[PDB]
Amino acid sequence: MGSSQPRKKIFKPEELRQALMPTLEALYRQDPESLPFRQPVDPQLLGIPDYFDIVKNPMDLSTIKRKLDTGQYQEPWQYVDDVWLMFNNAWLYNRKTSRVYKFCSKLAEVFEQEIDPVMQSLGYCCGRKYEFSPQTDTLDPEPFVDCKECGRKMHQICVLHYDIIWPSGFVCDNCLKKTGRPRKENKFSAKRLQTTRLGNHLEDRVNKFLRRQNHPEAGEVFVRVVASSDKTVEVKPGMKSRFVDSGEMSESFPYRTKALFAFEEIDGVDVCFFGMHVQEYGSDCPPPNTRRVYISYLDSIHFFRPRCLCTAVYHEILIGYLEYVKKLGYVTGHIWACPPSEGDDYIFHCHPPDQKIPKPKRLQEWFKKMLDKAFAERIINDYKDIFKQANEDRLTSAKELPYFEGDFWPNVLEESIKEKLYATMEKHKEVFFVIHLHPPIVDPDPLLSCDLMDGRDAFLTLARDKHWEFSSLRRSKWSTLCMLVELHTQGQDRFVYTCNECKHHVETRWHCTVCEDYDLCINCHTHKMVKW
């Protein structure tokens, strides 16, 4: 196994100890919590013959101090890997309630507190030992990268490096201004996703909502429609043999589905904090589904800054969505406000351990004050739950109720043919909403084919495989980084560009610095234009 890197950062024993040991000391100073840790665990004093079958690499403060004093640590990470072995062996063996389990956790908050600054002035990211959350005995570790010039290993996720964005390799931040060089731009930003009129309207609406509230920690929001697709929902076999064999409802029903996410700039980087999937049923779609939209799935990560503005802006996206489709020509909208089943993640792969899933009535109340704000806003002009709507509209037939993809009702009907049914309605009135908004519908936005976002399953599976967890602010940033690379670079659309005055095909063109998608010929406008 041949190796090389020539201007390595190597640490000689006592420069390490001069930096590292103040941290060991802070552990030792913790009294009594330190005491079961100043010595190697001795199962014959303690009375635990199982120990060495359980913890197969014992570690303790004294061993660490010996390695430090004698110089057996070449790089600081070996140091910090060794104390976390100490902690991890304790949390393993001992019961979550035992005393030394508790001792241990206190040494660890102390060590976290002390280790990060020193590892940082030694030019590393943190002093932590990170493993991804358990999958379907053992856990996967966070990735590292090596500065091409230091050689000093850093958490990939900490320093947010990805070779696709910077193919020349990773180089650290201090060596970078040693280089006189700043880091090249991450072109694969939320802002730089193709923009759409739908995405713009939601984007434009909320950020000067935020402007009106004007809290200092808030950053820019970007709303992007990352997929758009023409599908049709087939009538499930029972109801179709009973109704379209008859000729009373159509076999298929066309709809356009859109997936659209919302990003905020946090610490200088895009964080994805909201995502949604709609089904839009146009004006050519036969009854019962003509001119209506349906909010399939809605999902969220709580790292929007500030949290007090957080919920309001979710509402601003939703209400802004209905505002948009209204004017296009839609007339009614439909929310199935059903809260998650089973730690079911709707769109984002590993939610924060401490962002709790709501009970259904929380979620209904939520959606209800959602709609009240828009009613007051003169956006929606009325809304009711499904029975004040259904029996107020006098419906007696199963053909009369909108029939959506993946929706509850197609499948309550579908198995109800062998076996009563207005009652199966009456139970669940509070979970389904009917939104009254009020000349063919035509969508200005082009179709975006993105297989990763066609339906919610592709993004989730890819995230499981790539460990793009949304479970911490630092992981969401990294998961957002790579989500954005997937959208930018493995979308399915090729672009043919055309001149905005003559409609002609173009290769060379003069790109406005001004308009969001504008490109004049050479056969030539008001604005400064560059050649693209």
Ligand X SMILES: CC(C)(COP(=O)(O)OP(=O)(O)OC[C@H]1O[C@@H](n2cnc3c(N)ncnc32)[C@H](O)[C@@H]1OP(=O)(O)O)[C@@H](O)C(=O)NCCC(=O)NCCS
Strand, coil or helix: 46: helix
Give yes or no for a contact between 269 and 165, defined as CB atoms under 8 angstroms apart: no
What are the residues whose beta carbons fall under 8 Å from the beta carbon of 247, sequence distance 6 or more?
none
- DSSP 8-state symbol, 165: T
CA 434 vs CA 54, 92, 371, 387, 473: distances in Å: 58, 52, 11, 9, 36
The one of Zn ion, ligand X, none whose footprint includes residue 166, by CB under 5 to 8 A per kind, is none
How far CA 29 is from CA of 324, 343, 487, 530, in Å, comes to: 62, 41, 50, 64
φ/ψ of 100, rounded to 5, equals -75, -25
User: Residue holding tokens 């066309």?
Assistant: 254
CB of 457 closer than 8 Å to CB of 353 = no
Helices 61-70 and 13-28: angle between axes, nearest 10 degrees: 160
Q: Which residues contact 245 (CB under 8 A, 6 or more apart)?
A: none
Residue 197's binding partner, choosing from ligand X, Zn ion, none, with beta-carbon cut-off 5 to 8 A by kind? none
Least separation, in Å, of the C-beta of 367 and ligand X? Answer: 7
Task: Please calculate the CA angle 454-343-370 and round it to the nearest 5 degrees.
Answer: 70
237 versus 340: smaller Cβ distance to ligand X:
340
Min dist CB 170 to Zn ion, Å, is 8
Which listed range, 32-40, 101-109, 251-259, 512-520, lies at the site for Zn ion (CB under 5 A)? 512-520
Using rule CB under 5 A, residue 158 touches Zn ion: yes
Minimum distance of ligand X from residue 303's CB (angstroms)? 11
Which among ligand X, Zn ion, none contacts residue 356 (Cβ within 5 to 8 A by kind)?
ligand X
Calpha distance 78→90 (Å, rounded): 19
340 touches, from ligand X, Zn ion, none (C-beta below 5 to 8 Å by class): ligand X
User: Residue 299 touches which of Zn ion, ligand X, none (CB < 5 to 8 A by kind)?
Assistant: ligand X
Draw the binding track, 349-388, toward Zn ion (x: CB under 5 A; -: no contact). ----------------------------------------
Instruction: Choose the one of ligand X, Zn ion, none that binds residue 363, judging by a C-beta under 5 to 8 angstroms depending on kind.
Output: ligand X
Sketch the per residue contact string, 97 through 136, with Zn ion: x for CB under 5 A, - otherwise.
Answer: ----------------------------xx----------
Q: Which residues bind ligand X (CB under 6 A)?
A: 298-300, 302, 310-311, 314, 337-340, 346, 356-359, 362-363, 366
Q: Does 155 interact with Zn ion (rule: CB under 5 A)?
A: yes
Binding site for Zn ion (CB under 5 A): 125-126, 147, 149-150, 155, 158, 172, 175, 499, 501-502, 512, 514-515, 518, 521, 523, 527
